[PDB]
Amino acid sequence: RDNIQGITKPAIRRLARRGGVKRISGLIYEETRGVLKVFLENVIRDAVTYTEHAKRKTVTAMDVVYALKRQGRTLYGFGG
């Protein structure tokens, strides 16, 4: 469907909050959904390449880790 809109206005708020933002423009929610999209896009691609090269049909925690590490964005706690 169109699941990007499942990233609720309240959700993006909660995230701005943990980031230490007091006040939020209306325009932000769609810019945010905007950027999140490009993040998950660039990351999932490189993940699935790692899935594909491994000749699997199931994306493993490592695929995403290998991906995040690649993209500049290393993650601790899912292995590797």
Binding site: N3, L15, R17, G19, G20, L27, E31, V43, T60, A61
Partner: protein
């Protein structure tokens, strides 16, 4: 009158709340549905280790939050308190994420 807090007070309580906690701030399923969507653009009938979805949710939120942080500083830099697209935009331009 019925009792009421003043614009920006609840926000600040909400900052303290969410900077104290670690729990993920996006709804699990909606995010999952988003992931499997953006996966169909690269291969169909894929599957995902429960753990691979979370590893992304932790990767996404962590990311956004740090953007908001760099954003909120570009708002404050323009004598504001309100984050606006042009603030994010400046972050990403300087971060070297767009041109």
């Amino acid at each position: 009158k019925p009792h009421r807090y003043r614009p920006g007070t609840v926000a600040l309580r909400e900052i303290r709340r969410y900077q104290k906690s670690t729990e993920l701030l996006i709804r699990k399923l909606p995010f999952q549905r988003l992931v499997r969507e953006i996966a169909q653009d690269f291969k169909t009938d894929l599957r995902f280790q429960s753990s691979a979805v979370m590893a992304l949710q932790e990767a996404c939120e962590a990311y956004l939050v740090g953007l908001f942080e760099d954003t909120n500083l570009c708002a404050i830099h323009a004598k504001r308190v309100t984050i606006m697209p042009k603030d994010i935009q400046l972050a990403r331009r300087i971060r070297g994420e767009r041109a």
